[PDB]
Amino acid sequence: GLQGHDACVHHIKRRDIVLKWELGEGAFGKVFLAECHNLLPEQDKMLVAVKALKEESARQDFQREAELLTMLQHQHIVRFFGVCTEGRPLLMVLEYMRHGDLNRFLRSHGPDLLAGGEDVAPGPLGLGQLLAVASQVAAGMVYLAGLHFVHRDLATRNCLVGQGLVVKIGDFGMSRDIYSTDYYRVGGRTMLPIRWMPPESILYRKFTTESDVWSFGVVLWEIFTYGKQPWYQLSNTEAIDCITQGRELERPRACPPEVYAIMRGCWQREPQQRHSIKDVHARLQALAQAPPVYLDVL
Numbered sequence: 001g002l003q004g005h006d007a008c009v010h011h012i013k014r015r016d017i018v019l020k021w022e023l024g025e026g027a028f029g030k031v032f033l034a035e036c037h038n039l040l041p042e043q044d045k046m047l048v049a050v051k052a053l054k055e056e057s058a059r060q061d062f063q064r065e066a067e068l069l070t071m072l073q074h075q076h077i078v079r080f081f082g083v084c085t086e087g088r089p090l091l092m093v094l095e096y097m098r099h100g101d102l103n104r105f106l107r108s109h110g111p112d113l114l115a116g117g118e119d120v121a122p123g124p125l126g127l128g129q130l131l132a133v134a135s136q137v138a139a140g141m142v143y144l145a146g147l148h149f150v151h152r153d154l155a156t157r158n159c160l161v162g163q164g165l166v167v168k169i170g171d172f173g174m175s176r177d178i179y180s181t182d183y184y185r186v187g188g189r190t191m192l193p194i195r196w197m198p199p200e201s202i203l204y205r206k207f208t209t210e211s212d213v214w215s216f217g218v219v220l221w222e223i224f225t226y227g228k229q230p231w232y233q234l235s236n237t238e239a240i241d242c243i244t245q246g247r248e249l250e251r252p253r254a255c256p257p258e259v260y261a262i263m264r265g266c267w268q269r270e271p272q273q274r275h276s277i278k279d280v281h282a283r284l285q286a287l288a289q290a291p292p293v294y295l296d297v298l
């Protein structure tokens with residue numbers, strides 16, 4: 001949720017889009033892999049991800065998000081190419097990221113050869129790689145915070161990984177469907193990612209950019225646990241109890257004390273006492289680009 005405060009959006013002819021197969025499904029839409037012709041000059045035919053809108057008040061929500069996604073274009077935000085309102089169904093065309101969402105990617109390269117591939121070394125992701133993934137997400141949040149936007153659902157399941165392990169921020173979408181365990185259903189139709197939410201959000205229903213750095217601290221934890229659910233040993237209410245009462249997540253086995261200090265800095269009780277996202281990224285990128293000699297002794 002980017003809230004977070006015709007045709008500014010670009011438009012793609014329906015004939016230029018050729019659906020290949022389904023990549024996944026949500027309650028509000030399906031995502032397809034597709035060929036998109038004449039989209040980029042250098043590539044005569046390129047693969048894209050196409051989200052098809054399920055159904056009457058969604059057109060308004062559709063137009064909103066498209067306008068948002070077109071404005072929010074940065075190196076670590078998922079690339080948005082445009083929409084196809086040329087008849088129905090309404091389509092949204094996005095960059096395809098072959099490794100899927102970051103959470104799934106983390107689990108498939110967690111401990112535990114066979115896992116290694118074109119983009120990834122075998123076995124568990126190295127320290128340098130985990131920092132590289134974390135640094136990229138932070139950069140994305142630095143951009144969002146710079147435009148004074150707020151991401152109300154920052155989690156690895158809402159990040160995407162592409163070729164060369166390029167990591168970009170999105171916001172599913174599908175996350176409420178069969179990632180359901182990550183959300184707590186309040187009221188009739190509201191779901192809250194409580195395990196990622198700071199005390200002021202759970203208690204006071206406030207969410208600011210300072211809340212995002214708390215949420216990022218949790219993302220940083222997800223990364224170094226290779227995509228483990230935060231407070232996985234706790235029920236939703238028990239998680240609410242622990243968060244509002246000041247209890248913090250344990251240091252992940254793969255997480256160095258140097259990096260765990262960055263998490264704690266993101267997890268200060270008082271919002272104004274947390275570090276800025278610009279500074280968290282700064283510290284992470286320094287480690288990401290740090291020579292092996294430096295990182296080995298971490």
Ligand SMILES: Cc1c2cc(cc1C(=O)Nc1cc(CN3CCN(C)CC3)cc(C3CC3)c1)OCCCCCCCNC(=O)c1ccc3ncc(n3n1)C#C2
Binds near residue numbers: 001024027069078160
């Ligand atoms: C990337 C993406 C894909 C599919 C989706 C949604 C999204 C997405 O980020 N949207 C989104 C929306 C807002 C609006 N905001 C404000 C107002 N709020 C009220 C709402 C939320 C804000 C932002 C932030 C700026 C970034 C992002 O729809 C999900 C359809 C269900 C099927 C998905 C199945 C699982 N998908 C995969 O496993 C997979 C594999 C490869 C691949 N390449 C590209 C994509 N992709 N996905 C995508 C997407």
